[PDB]
Amino acid sequence: ALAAVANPSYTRLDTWNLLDDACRHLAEVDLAGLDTTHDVARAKRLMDRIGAYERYWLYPGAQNLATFRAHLDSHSTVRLTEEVSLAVRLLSEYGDRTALQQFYTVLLADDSSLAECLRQLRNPADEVQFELLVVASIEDAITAVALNGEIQAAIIRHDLPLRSRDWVECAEWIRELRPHIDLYLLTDESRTFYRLNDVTDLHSTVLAGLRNRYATPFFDALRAYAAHGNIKTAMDKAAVTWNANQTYFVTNGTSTANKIVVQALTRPGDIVLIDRNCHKSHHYGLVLAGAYPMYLDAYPLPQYAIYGAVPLRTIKQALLDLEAAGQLHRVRMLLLTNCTFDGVVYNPRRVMEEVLAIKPDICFLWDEAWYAFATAVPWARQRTAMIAAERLEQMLSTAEYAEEYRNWCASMDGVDRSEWVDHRLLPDPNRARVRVYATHSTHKSLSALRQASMIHVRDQDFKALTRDAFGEAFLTHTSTSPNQQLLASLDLARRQVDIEGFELVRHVYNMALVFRHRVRKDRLISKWFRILDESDLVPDAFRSLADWNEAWRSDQFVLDPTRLTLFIGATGMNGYDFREKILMERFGIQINKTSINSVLLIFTIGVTWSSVHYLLDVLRRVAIDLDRSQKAASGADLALHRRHVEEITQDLPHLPDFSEFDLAFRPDDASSFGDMRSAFYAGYEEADREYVQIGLAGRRLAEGKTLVSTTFVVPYPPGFPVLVPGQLVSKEIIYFLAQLDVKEIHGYNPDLGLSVFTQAALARMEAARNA
Amino acid sequence: ALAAVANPSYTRLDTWNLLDDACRHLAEVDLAGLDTTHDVARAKRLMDRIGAYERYWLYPGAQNLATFRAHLDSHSTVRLTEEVSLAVRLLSEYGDRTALQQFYTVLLADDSSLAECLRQLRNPADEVQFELLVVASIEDAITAVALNGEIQAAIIRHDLPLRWVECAEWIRELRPHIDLYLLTDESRTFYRLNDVTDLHSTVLAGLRNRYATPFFDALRAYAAHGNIKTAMDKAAVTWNANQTYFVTNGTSTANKIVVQALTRPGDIVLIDRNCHKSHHYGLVLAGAYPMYLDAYPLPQYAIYGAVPLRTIKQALLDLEAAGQLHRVRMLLLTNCTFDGVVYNPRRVMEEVLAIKPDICFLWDEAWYAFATAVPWARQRTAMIAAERLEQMLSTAEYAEEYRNWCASMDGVDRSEWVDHRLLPDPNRARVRVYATHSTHKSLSALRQASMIHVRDQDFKALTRDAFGEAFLTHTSTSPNQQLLASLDLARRQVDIEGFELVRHVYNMALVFRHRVRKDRLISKWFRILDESDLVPDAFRSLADWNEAWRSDQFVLDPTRLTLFIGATGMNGYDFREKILMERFGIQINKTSINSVLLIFTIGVTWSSVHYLLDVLRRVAIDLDRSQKAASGADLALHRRHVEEITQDLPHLPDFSEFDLAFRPDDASSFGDMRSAFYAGYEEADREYVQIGLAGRRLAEGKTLVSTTFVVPYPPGFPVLVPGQLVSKEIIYFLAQLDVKEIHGYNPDLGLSVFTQAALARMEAARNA
């Protein structure tokens, strides 16, 4: 899987340009009559390196790499230079088209011809064209697909040598590495084919699959207009792309997709386990639904003032506490953001397994707004909610899993349920129901238009339990005149993932890893700038190429490299004012979040190596100016700068945990879930609301006049509601908000103070809550 | 004002074509040497007709029309023909700008020069150009603005022969968006002699202000508190709001933002029963208690009207007798009903604020964003009504009128107040009006783009925090910029083009209505429902028609064209399908048992009207063909279909009740529809009753209560809402429907209703 990201093959385009400049240099040597030995040896070495992988690309190929070796071994420098220049020119735009309209590479794994028959079947006028990349082994097939993103389809012989010269298991590896490419089987034994009998129906089937994954029914219909129907087909193709059972297009973003799902699954007073640092759209969806959130604290990253992911032990503990309270039955759903804004990726399969061990019929909503692209690539795909859900269902169905569960139950003889937090947990096969949901803001990660989203449903009980509720929620939240351009953009993004998705997203990951490497190695940047590692953003408690492939497979959290938290603390300037006065003011670089000492940069499918050079050059320029200041600075200026660096990096205020809801708003005194809807509307009783200055708040806590938030206080440096309606304003929250000079705090106005419930109000509400 | 619609000068472009037709033929007579007397007299008559109004337009105007008169009186037919052809050609595309880039006419009301000075100030290279249409009177000024929709600015002398402040208000009344400037030589207002250069700059600046689209231009520059704030401020000024909020998810969501912002759970909301579904879902989200108000029936057509104001007043006074008036927080009415019935907001707000001086009004004006362009429809718009209502309350003249009204109400019981036209107390009535506009439905804006318009006196104090939280609740954090830029473009459209555009639509609707009435071949098979059809006499009391829009309780908007097809003997559903769509591709907005609703919009053109007329002529021709080919048995079957479609129509069922399980107050009709909505998802408490069994079960007394919104296609509105009693009328209505598009009701399963055990348990809890 993750090996596909790291190989010479991805940099092959650069290596071919390198060959084109070595070959030109060889020509410049030969035209001068000088000793060619140096540049012939250079070109030979480069081409021999290229020959490690060029067999897997249609146009330059082994045939023409060999032809160039033959030309070079005859010192035909002029011809060799001309042909290499031509080859790399065609390569730059015609990646594989020069092998011969849509054009796709089709892998044929056949050591045997079928290739020539399929070529003869090709009609040059057809709208979609392909050329066969023939490979003579299973290992060569898997390498070809993984390395070559252009291989839209694969054709596999039943008889194939596993060893490389230089079958169901081959097919499963192709499906694993390249989830969207069409995979076909040939079988001479007395989709699968008979190779001799059907080369014309094989050709037709390959063309049909390619058109199926290229055709955009709704975008084409909208073009024809502008010049149950096509929208159903587009949603079905989206479901097939994102491994959902059903897909629902939403034209008010994932803010509204979240609410549709929450309302569909939750009735008023359903307990929802939710990441405390969830998107605000979840907080508002909860107040709308009237569900009782039990907020789960994401583990702290004190050095950076950012939250991580919610540890699985936290979820398990919450569920088991609710069970001890007898409130587990009420619990209806867990809301987790599969990739945190900062890039901390949950392992959904493990979280759903251990949660369904506690609550076999809980629903999962994964707010994967940033991870729509992830389905394109196997390493991130496996961590996607729909793929995790399918894999979990397929495990729960297997008899071998049933034996494994029986052994696990035997291992759990006499273990208390309270202890279950200590031990890894397996869902019951005969009770665990897989009811997984995802919401994708396609625009954030893909070409889709802004405000276009996709709810992905893989729920075993959707048709009975949730279909009517989900229809009524969809009618509640969507407008009756949805914008057709947004839906067509979702169809276009689906087609992009289906065809271009693997190469695009793999390139994004490559570019993010290249940027990380260049920033780390470069001594001029590295002294002033840092990009936070897995070890920075993911504690050891949660981390256990082979080891890095296993990390994405099996670790609880991984850092997605495409989320690039540039730590700037060594520069001694706020993240906010680094974004403003350097990135935006000087360089126009947009970024997604700022932090006290770090700036988050998210690479997307549109990133190019030119963008990576731009960012690297920008950081080099800033480092140069910082070195200029350091060498011009007096000892007093150096002292001030060192003080700023300490302020930005050392005495950071710990981001506060969720202080509980007030007993006025916790329905169960024994349980942490709160009636946050009630507190939300109660905060609009102006007789019940008052304002407490934060300088007075800390003293009032000593008086015991319990401060309880009426409103979502949402400081931007965290970026999350630090208080929610009905939340106890704790000593740590007072302290945090006091240590903030930032002017963008929503719901908190330092001119007035914290909007808090009056003690009389709280007393009355507590009385009501009792009786 | 409405006479700005019903005038000959609208057709002057056609009439100028007529001259070209009549002038060219004159030449064809002269070139043959024939007697010209016939065609010279035709041209003279036509031009004399043109001359009654052409002085109000720039390019041909009094000058060229007088030149053509001279030519025609000298029989210079060839020259006359050429210059008429040239003029009418230029008139068609550039006929404003040919008087000389944005180009606008500016009226100068000046009988006196400022004109030549302002012309001299003009620089041909300027982005925005204008030429002065000078007129010599107030009445010529008023007529010029009203007729010439290309006039964008007015400059008025203080001394003007009527045959000036009153003049100005008529300009503002008729042309609310055009910039209105005053000249005043006495020792925006100007000194005519002193400042010809700053007048010029001011005119240019105002035109630029209403033309400049800050956000669309910014989005173009990007694609090649900030501009979005400026666009919203310009939208507020265009739609006469105090504030405007751009909702990217459409009026569906604009409605919910407002309802959430104004209502807390348990706050009674009076609402029309024919309200859009987005209000039903907004109520279950907000937890408000709807008191659904019956729109008056139109039994012949199976459509609802508007909610009578007596019904609103009675509901408020019933809630007062129950002691529940204080809970009431808002009245929700759709200012224009789907079928075109226009409420008079000023009268509804006045008489409602007499009962509940601090009620908020949300006007779901999704179809009426265009209306603000034109004075007749504008005056019936929520924001203009709110401003006029606010101004009236502040005047001391109204305080005396209110004192006289209170003196007239001495000893009258409040129960009788439904009988008497009420007046709001100026010392208590707070004007808290809201509107939501689906700009796309009525204007060029992109689909799903909406504008909440707020004119609320207590917005800053009470609603500002609640409205921000609701706006954060319902809008997405990554709104589509193209939708917002489309709202800026639609604002610019209304600011400049809107009057001529919208006034053209009404003209087109009236033309279409007139042509359908006169044409004997269409009129025998097709009808467009009149005011008298869609508005009972009880609610209706050129000058008479102007007073109707000003003062009648309801009016029919002509732009909503309910084509009655019952005489054709085919369903409105299958008329849309098997004729309009199948044969002609004609899209329409709604269908009914015997009618099809066609809504004209700014893009409507006379060519579209010929298409519609020709289509109805073709269908009438085929129907006449069938009538003359039909046997007596075929004619009998056809007569039966007409009776089925038109005579024994099932009455649309009024709202019944919310049940005692869901009515929080036994004495009051409002119900906790939220609780019923979510109670309907307990599968142990829900059951299905077949409608063939439902009528019997009502005789058993096993009260049927809907768990879900049952939305039958012919009405298009929830006939049942969660927790509503399924009445004999509703059972009968749903039994008499063969339609397959009923949401929430599956005839395979039956009506989803609460079990009797569930109802008993819920009622037990509600009482105690």
Domain match, A542 and A470 both:
no
CB contact under 8 A, B478 and A444: yes
Of B281, B472, B479, the CB nearest to A451: B479
CATH number at residue A538: 3.90.1150.10
Of B250, B478, B677, the CB nearest to A441: B478
Residue B307 within a domain? no
Nearest C-alpha of chain B: how many angstroms from A255?
5
CB contact under 8 A, B252 and A480: yes
CATH number at residue A472: 3.40.640.10
Neighboring chain A residues of B438 at a CB cutoff of 8 Å: 481
Closest Cα partner for A510 from A605, A618, A370, A371? A605
Domain match, A264 and A405 both:
yes
Domain match, B79 and B115 both:
no
Closest Cα partner for B295 from B268, B274, B278? B274
Residue A512 within a domain? yes
Question: What 3-state DSSP class applies to B291?
Answer: strand
Residue B509 phi/psi, 5° resolution? -60, -45
Domain match, B513 and B619 both:
yes
CB contact under 8 A, B478 and A284: no
Rounded CA-CA distance A510/A497 in Å is 17
Domain match, A696 and A605 both:
no
User: Is B473 an 8 Å CB contact of chain A?
Assistant: yes
User: Is A287 an 8 Å CB contact of chain B?
Assistant: yes
Domain match, B564 and B587 both:
yes
User: Is B478 an 8 Å CB contact of chain A?
Assistant: yes
Rounded CA-CA distance A57/A97 in Å is 11
Q: How far is CA B102 from CA A275, A686, B133, B215, B602, in A?
A: 55, 51, 16, 19, 20
Question: What 3-state DSSP class applies to B292?
Answer: strand
Q: Which amino acid is at B360?
A: C
Rounded CA-CA distance B438/B429 in Å is 29
Rounded CA-CA distance B760/B768 in Å is 12
CB contact under 8 A, B476 and A681: no
Q: What is the DSSP string of A222-239?
A: HHHHH---HHHHHHHHHH
- Written as six digits, the tokens of B256 are 């919910």
Range of the domain at A175: 100-214
Last residue of a domain, one of A95, A115, A146: A95
A664 and A708 in contact (C-beta within 8 Å)?
yes
Domain match, B60 and B106 both:
no
Rounded CA-CA distance B612/B426 in Å is 50
User: Is B589 an 8 Å CB contact of chain A?
Assistant: no
B554 and B539 in contact (C-beta within 8 Å)?
yes
Residue B735 within a domain? yes
Domain match, A471 and A518 both:
no
Number of domains making up chain B: 5
Domain match, B491 and B502 both:
no
Rounded CA-CA distance A356/A393 in Å is 12
Q: How was this structure determined?
A: cryo-EM
A425 and A362 in contact (C-beta within 8 Å)?
no
Residue B356 within a domain? no
User: Is A94 an 8 Å CB contact of chain B?
Assistant: no
How many residue pairs from chains A and B have C-beta atoms closer than 8 A? Answer: 104
Residue B752 phi/psi, 5° resolution? -70, 115
Residue A164 within a domain? yes
Contacts of B437 (CB under 8 A, 6+ apart): B239, B251, B254, B365, B366, B368, B369, B450, B451, B452, B453
Domain match, A110 and A76 both:
no
Residue B55 within a domain? yes
Residue A649 within a domain? no
CB contact under 8 A, A451 and B265: no
Q: How far is CA B274 from CA A123, B211, B278, in A?
A: 59, 38, 11
Named by the residue before each, gaps in chain B exceeding 2.5 A from C to N are: 100, 112, 163, 187, 224, 541
Domain match, A272 and A383 both:
yes
B466 and B256 in contact (C-beta within 8 Å)?
no
Count Cα neighbours of B579 within 13 Å in the Cβ-side half-sphere. Answer: 22
Domain match, A459 and A562 both:
no
Neighboring chain B residues of A680 at a CB cutoff of 8 Å: 469
User: Which bin fits A269, alpha (ψ -120 to 50), beta or left (φ > 0)?
Assistant: left
Question: What 3-state DSSP class applies to B35?
Answer: coil
Last residue of a domain, one of A600, A633, A666: A633
Q: Which amino acid is at A628?
A: R
Closest Cα partner for B130 from B237, B208, B13, B66? B208
Chain A nearest-CA residue for B248: A252
Residue B267 within a domain? no
Nearest C-alpha of chain A: how many angstroms from B309?
28
| 3-class SS shares of chain B: helix, strand, coil, % to 5 | 50, 15, 35
Last residue of a domain, one of A157, A182, A214: A214
B272 and B295 in contact (C-beta within 8 Å)?
yes
A575 and A331 in contact (C-beta within 8 Å)?
no
Q: How far is CA B538 from CA B294, B312, B349, B553, in A?
A: 16, 15, 19, 9
Of B265, B479, B482, the CB nearest to A681: B265
CATH number at residue B729: 3.90.100
Neighboring chain A residues of B285 at a CB cutoff of 8 Å: 288, 476
